[PDB]
Amino acid sequence: LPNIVILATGGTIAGSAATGTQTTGYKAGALGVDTLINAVPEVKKLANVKGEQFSNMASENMTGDVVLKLSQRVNELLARDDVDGVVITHGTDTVEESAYFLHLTVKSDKPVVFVAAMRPATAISADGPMNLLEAVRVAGDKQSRGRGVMVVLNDRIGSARYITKTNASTLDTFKANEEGYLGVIIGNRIYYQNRIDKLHTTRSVFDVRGLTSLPKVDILYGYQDDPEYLYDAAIQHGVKGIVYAGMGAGSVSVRGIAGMRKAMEKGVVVIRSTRTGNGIVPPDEELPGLVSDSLNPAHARILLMLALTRTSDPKVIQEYFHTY
Amino acid sequence: LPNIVILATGGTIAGSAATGTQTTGYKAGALGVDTLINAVPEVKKLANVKGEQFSNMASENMTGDVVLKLSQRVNELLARDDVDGVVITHGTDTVEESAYFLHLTVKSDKPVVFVAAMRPATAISADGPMNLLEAVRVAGDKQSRGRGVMVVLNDRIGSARYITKTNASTLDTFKANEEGYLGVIIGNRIYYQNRIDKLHTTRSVFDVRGLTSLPKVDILYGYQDDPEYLYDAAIQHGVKGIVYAGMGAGSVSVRGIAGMRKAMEKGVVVIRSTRTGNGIVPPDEELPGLVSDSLNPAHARILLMLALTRTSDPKVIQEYFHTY
Amino acid sequence: LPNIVILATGGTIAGSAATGTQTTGYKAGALGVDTLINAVPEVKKLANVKGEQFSNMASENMTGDVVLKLSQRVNELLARDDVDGVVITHGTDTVEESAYFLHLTVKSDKPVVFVAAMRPATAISADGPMNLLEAVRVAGDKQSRGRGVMVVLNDRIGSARYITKTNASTLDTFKANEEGYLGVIIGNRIYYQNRIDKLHTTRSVFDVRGLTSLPKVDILYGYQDDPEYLYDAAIQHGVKGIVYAGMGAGSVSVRGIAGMRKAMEKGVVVIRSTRTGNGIVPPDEELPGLVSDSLNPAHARILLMLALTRTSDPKVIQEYFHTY
Amino acid sequence: LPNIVILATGGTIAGSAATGTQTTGYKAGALGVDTLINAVPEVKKLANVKGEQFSNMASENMTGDVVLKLSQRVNELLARDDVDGVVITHGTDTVEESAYFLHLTVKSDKPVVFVAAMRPATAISADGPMNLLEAVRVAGDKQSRGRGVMVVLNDRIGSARYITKTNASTLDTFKANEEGYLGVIIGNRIYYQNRIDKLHTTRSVFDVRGLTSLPKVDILYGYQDDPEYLYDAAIQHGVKGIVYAGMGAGSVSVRGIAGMRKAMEKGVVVIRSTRTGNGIVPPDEELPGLVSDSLNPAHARILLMLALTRTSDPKVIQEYFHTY
Ligand SMILES: N[C@@H](CC(=O)O)C(=O)O
Ligand SMILES: N[C@@H](CC(=O)O)C(=O)O
Ligand SMILES: N[C@@H](CC(=O)O)C(=O)O
Ligand SMILES: N[C@@H](CC(=O)O)C(=O)O
């Protein structure tokens, strides 16, 4: 059997409420990893699992300094001969951010699978137990190697680069509308469909081993009447990058243009992304900043933060956006 | 034949580029309304059309003061016995905002149909001509009355309350993943599928006749490491409301909580929405602010602005979010 | 509390397998209704429920003669003052057919909610418990009246007319891509979004009280090299109608045209539907047969069977396809 | 510039109607290939194109014997040093069948791109011109090599293995809900997202050079009351295989089981697929026949026909269903 480490960070998957139908007033990140494992003893037929408690928080409180430590820990684990893969239990709300960070920074082809749940462990029809079992199956399969970081929920295997939480509250929320899933798990069998045609993991140039902090990057929304003062505030607080969750294809109002030009004059890198949820922001030399390709704003922030650890050259940063 | 006014505001539908494949370096909002009409002379078999040029701008520059005028003009037009419906040509980037504004403020059951195009008029396979023809068909059909404000592109009829631009750059971008379309136009025939179960138009309390400006509302994004200083900036600039494009189901970090509590102390109304793109943000009294129900951040901003013209009572505002 | 009858027919919701991960070799339709109710005692806080065992079969074996009796029983129940609504447990494979049959033949505005499960009751993270509780919530809410027959799974409320099983094996399979959901159930609260703009239930002309069988209707697939001999076989076995699950928009090969013309010469009514999964098959007088509007093949069969209890007139039948 | 052959077979892309809004009463496959080319002279900046007229038919009339000749011709063309790629203009209705056939039988890494249109060439906002330009762009890019056969419409590049016509009548009908697109074409640039994780073209065992006909395979639908006599008819007419477009996950009624057992006793190979549109049909040794994995019925028929040119062995055929 493969040796899988379950590295727990918190989330609703580790939530415990007073009744089976209670959806508020409980902490998302209360139960320990061994309680998760022991609720699905079937996992022991799939792998030799060892639980490690990395943190226990709601993912809306996950921070880059913590995700950096997570990446460093996972790199240490996967460097061991006695670790075949890692499953990371996490909150759903920012799992796409943490997962994409590890996608770019983990220097191994051994699987790294993020798993989460939309219902707490105490819920009627809780999804966490099956999601964890699926995640372990994926992490221990030798066919799962070399595929980049994955996010597994609801019988689907999503690439960290494409997968996003698309719905505030449903079990099927994690989708990649234009890129689909890497694979699916049906009837206790994994079906791989796609390999992502982007750089990642052992083919990624990003390395943050030995870093202890990351560049500051903020995200500003685009909308009718969007204000220039938010750009001024970000600049004043020393951001190194701004990701613009733009109207349409990174379109920018007269006010946003003024903000962006100010930022660029102070050496801030601006990435024009989109608030729409999907698709390509194409190059446009008449507008300020760089473009995000198909990265959504949350992902774009992660790639920009990592880019800024190793370059300040806009040409190189733009090329990263087209290749990672 | 029905008498339809085509009220033009700009957009890529009125864009004109130097070649058939050029997608940048042209102004979205350059062609006049009569050029659009004359490019589809078939529209004169469907309706007696009259063009009126309201504005000619890219929709990323549309502002609430201008949308207020638009609403007022459309009400004047629909008050006339010689006007059976209005088609509004507009940019795709913010059409959802303008349309939802009119959905709540137009005091007639006569059809109001927004139309737009993802490719400029000069493009190969431009979508504007057929979109405009479909929109005119919709606006003139007696079966279209009483349905709320509609957005028509790509053979689909979307409710202004549910429809959003979901993709930065595709023709099929306008979708309502959970709510579907009101109807479709296939083979020159309209097929109505749904009526929205929300208040609108003639049953809406919002009336902005005579107003000349609207309450200031900004939108802030939720993400890992989201900073409190953006709340401080918005407060300092005198916002009346803040819409939060939250992680997951309006989930809030410790920093966002501190920001939101500060804003609420100053009398700012905070609405928690979602950055995910779809779904319900459920109530949670322990978190700050009101919740957006299934309104996305752009729509939630429009409803909040209108709500604040009538009330500062949280109970009443929250009920608007559940019913409009 | 509302009085709700849970009328059980079988399905995977009532399936019981030897382990938590076994997905084959168990009978869908083994557990009794009271075992379903007793697994979710929370239901007794939502309604006064009474279980009735109508049948216990896998839904692939559900037949029109049995669905007729199901409709007749439901009508009997809803005619009672002591019944406020009904939930029908059923297999997922043909629930859309049974549900649409009841949608057209149930003469009450009281809610009728079909419910099902993709994983058996014994499965890890079984969906049936929560699906049943959601269904009971929907059936007992006074806001649910007059909406037509509903299908409830995975926090979604779908209209019987639009909802279909879109995926062979996932929990989120029931979707209506173009029409959306009537509503959703999130955080123990129902959010109604739409009302279907079609005839149903109390406004439907179809009445089958007193019938003991239905007219025979088969479905033939369209594809490259589709054979004429399948039309001959159907005609020889006495079908009254044929639904063609056509290529594209009910397109027909030379072979299919010959088969259809032969069928129509014998008095068979032919409906051209689509194998695609969605959309409108538009009228085309140059092709044989009537068109299915947006009814998929399984639904189109149900409507044709019901139509043939009332009329043989093509004009009238075609109008049913456009209104039901 | 690359040298691209445009091999025309017909379809609505080659349709010509009397007015810009006419959607019936015109032949789909009337215009010649040069007339398509001459409508988009921009193509000359992308490639040196040569048109060749293979056929001119509606795709509902495409037959396996003709697709076999199409595959043979494409193989001849791509064996030439002066051909870099091939674009095939085709009807939308069965493009997925012809494309998947070529995906398994074309013995080259040079791109083969099928292209089609939902609106005829004479239509207002006809999609064919831009679809053809995109297809030529894809066929001529050196990055497009080795990706398997592609289907290009509406700015999307779909794998022939996953893409299907999902809507009877809309421009955006070609989707792969679970597998996404291989890439997209926005702003005159190709963005590759995925590589399919299945065998195709140069790695495929299927070679039909020298064949003039193929094994007979029919498709039978699954539904309530599905009749055994259709199996008897297929058997009597000498089918070598039957693809069952099953209820749910290839579920079979008692009648279908009896039919399938009869077919198998006569040496017919039975593949259980799904009518649902998407997803995996899992193995189940208690049911008759082989399973289609995620192939939909139309694709399953194509694979089974090709498999039968080589083997009758169920173990090998089942493996093909899991790897092609
Ligand atoms: N707020 C929770 C939500 C979840 O996990 O479903 C979290 O992200 O930690
Ligand atoms: N920027 C343009 C884009 C479009 O209309 O497609 C607009 O919103 O005005
Ligand atoms: N074959 C089962 C499948 C399910 O219910 O999920 C049924 O329809 O009865
Ligand atoms: N019946 C046409 C439809 C199209 O091309 O859109 C064909 O398949 O040939």
CATH of the domain at D282: 3.40.50.40
In chain B, residues with a C-beta closer than 8 Å to the C-beta of C156 are 178
Task: Point out the residue among C167, C225, C251 whose CB comes nearest to the CB of D278.
Answer: C167
Q: Are D177 and D287 contained in the same domain?
A: no
> In angstroms, what is the span from residue C128 Cα to ligand 3's centroid?
12
Beta-carbon separation of B230 and A230 below 8 A:
yes
Phi, psi of A110 (to 5 degrees): -65, 145
| Statement to judge: residues D209 and D277 lie in one domain | no
- Of B73, B81, B131, which is closest to residue B102 (Cα–Cα)? B73
Kindly report the nearest CA distance between residue C318 and chain A, in angstroms: 36
C-alpha angle A239/A242/A243, rounded to 5°?
Answer: 150
Determine the residue of chain A that is closest to B283 in CA distance: A24
Strand order in the sheet with D189-192: D48-57, D3-10, D85-89, D112-115, D150-153, D156-159, D183-186, D189-192
Which of B163, B178, B293 best tests the C interface by mutation, with the highest count of C CBs <10 A?
Answer: B178
One domain for residues A59 and A184: yes
Strands C150-153 and C156-159: antiparallel
Could you tell me which residues of D are annotated as the binding site for substrate? 59, 92-93
Within 8 A of D154 by CB-CB distance, chain B residues are 170-172
The whole-angstrom separation of Cα C158 and Cα C114 is 10
Sign of CA dihedral C91, C94, C98, C99: positive
Ligand closest to CA D224: 3
Distance separating alpha carbons of residues A122 and A19, to the nearest angstrom? 7
For residue C215, how far is its CA from the centre of ligand 3 (angstroms)? Answer: 25
Please say which residue of D215, D231, D246 terminates a domain. D215
Q: Are C278 and D168 in contact (CB under 8 A)?
A: yes
What is the C12 CA–ligand 3 centroid distance (Å)? 5
Nearest CA to ligand 3 atom 5: C91
Give the CA distances from residue C7 to residues B191, C116, C174, in Å, rounded to whole numbers and listed in that order.
Answer: 35, 12, 21
Q: Is B93 annotated as a binding residue?
A: yes
Domain residue limits at D318 = 216-324
The CB density around residue A284, as the number of other CB atoms within 10 Å, is 18
Instruction: Say which of B23, B164, B282 has its CB closest to residue A23.
Output: B282
Q: Which residue has the tokens 């504005």?
A: B55
CA angle D59–D61–D63, rounded 5-degree value? 100
**C185/C269 same-domain check:** no
| Residue in D closest to A192 by C-alpha | D197
Distance CA C83, CA C73 (A): 12
User: Do the beta carbons of residue C58 and residue C27 sit within 8 Å?
Assistant: yes
Interface test with C, best of B184, B191, B193 (most C CBs within 10 A): B193
CA D133 – CA D36 distance, rounded (Å): 10
CB contact under 8 A, A191 and D293: yes
Q: End of a domain among D199, D215, D231?
A: D215
Beta bridge partners of B5: B50, B86
Pocket of ligand 1 (CB under 6 A): A 10-12, 28, 58-60, 91-93, 116, 118; B 248, 251
Query: Do B215 and B69 contact (CB within 8 A), yes or no?
Result: no
Same domain, C158 and C228: no
Give the active site residue among C12, C105, C164, C274: C12
Nearest ligand to the C-alpha of residue A55? 1
Cα of C48 vs its chain's centroid, Å: 26
Q: Do A21 and A94 fall into the same domain?
A: yes
The answer to whether the CB atoms of D168 and C64 lie below 8 A apart is no
Which of A297, A290, A286, A279 minimizes the C-alpha distance to A312? Answer: A290
Q: How far is CA A30 from the centre of its chain?
A: 21
Q: Which of A173, A159, A102, A96 is nearest to D197 (CA)?
A: A159
Minimum CA–CA partner of B25 in chain A:
A286
Tokens read off for A137: 């199956």
Instruction: Give the end of a domain, one of D171, D187, D215.
Output: D215
Q: CA geometry: angle at D160 spanning D154 and D163, to 5°?
A: 55
Residue B92 CA to ligand 2 centre (angstroms): 5
Together in a domain, A18 and A110: yes
CB A182 within 8 A of CB A205: no
- What is the distance between the alpha carbons of residues A81 and C303, in angstroms, rounded to a whole number? 63
The experimental technique used to determine this model is: X-ray
Task: State the Cα–Cα distance between residues A127 and A99, nearest whole angstrom.
Answer: 20
The one-character DSSP state at C241 is E
Ligand 3 pocket check for C153: Cβ under 6 Å: no
Of residues C157, C185, C141, C188, the one with CA closest to residue C1: C141
Q: Which residue has the tokens 């997202």?
A: D193
Judgement on whether residues A206 and A297 belong to the same structural domain of the protein: no
Q: Count of residues for chain D?
A: 324
Determine which residue's CA is closest to atom 8 belonging to ligand 3: C91
Whether the CA torsion D189, D195, D198, D200 is positive or negative: it is: positive
Question: Which residue's structure tokens are 């053809």?
Answer: D132
| C94 plus C58 within the same structural domain | yes
Residue located nearest, by CA, to atom 6 of ligand 1 = A118
As for ligand 2, residues whose beta carbon falls within 6 Å of it are: A 248, 251; B 10-12, 28, 58-60, 91-93, 116, 118
The radius of gyration computed from the CA coordinates of chain A, to the nearest angstrom, equals 20
Dig out the tokens for D33 from the structure: 């290939």
Q: Are C250 and C274 contacting, i.e. CB atoms less than 8 angstroms apart?
A: yes
Whichever domain contains C14, its CATH number is 3.40.50.1170
Q: How far apart are CA B177 and CA B164, in angstroms?
A: 9
* Tally of domains within chain D: 2
Enter the resolution in angstroms: 1.6
Known binding residue B59? Answer is: yes
- Best to test chain A binding among B59, B60, B287 (most A CBs inside 10 Å): B60
Looking at the fold, whether D183 and D221 belong to one and the same domain comes out as: no
**Residue B324: closest CA among chain C residues belongs to which residue?**
C193
Question: What is the nearest CA distance from C250 to chain D, expressed in angstroms?
Answer: 8
* Secondary structure percentages of chain D, helix, strand, coil, to 5: 30, 25, 45
Do residue C283 and residue C181 come from a single domain? Answer: no
Separation between Cα atoms, residue D273 and residue B296, nearest integer Å: 39
- Residues A176, A264 within the same domain: no
Nearest to A190, CA basis, from A156, A151, A238: A156
**Chains interfacing with C (3 or more CB pairs < 8 Å):** A, B, D
Distance of residue C183 Cα from the nearest chain B Cα, in angstroms? 8
Return the residue matching tokens 């919530």: C137
A12 tagged catalytic: yes
Q: How far is CA D139 from CA A111, C269, D50, D180, in A?
A: 34, 45, 13, 20
Distance D163 CA to ligand 2 centre (A): 29
DSSP string for residues in D78-117 = HTSTT--EEEEE--STTHHHHHHHHHHH---SS-EEEE--
Reading the block at residue B244, the tokens are: 């939060």
For residue C16, the tally of other CB atoms under 10 A from its CB is 17
Nearest to B94 by CA among B64, B127, B130, B129: B64
Q: Which two structure tokens, joined as six digits, stand for C197?
A: 């703009």
> Which of C59, C114, C165, C174 to probe ligand 3 with, by most ligand atoms within 8 A of CB?
C59
- Ligand 2 centroid to residue B262 C-alpha, Å: 36
Q: What whole-number distance in Å separates Cα of residue D236 and Cα of residue A25?
A: 66
3 state SS of B164: strand
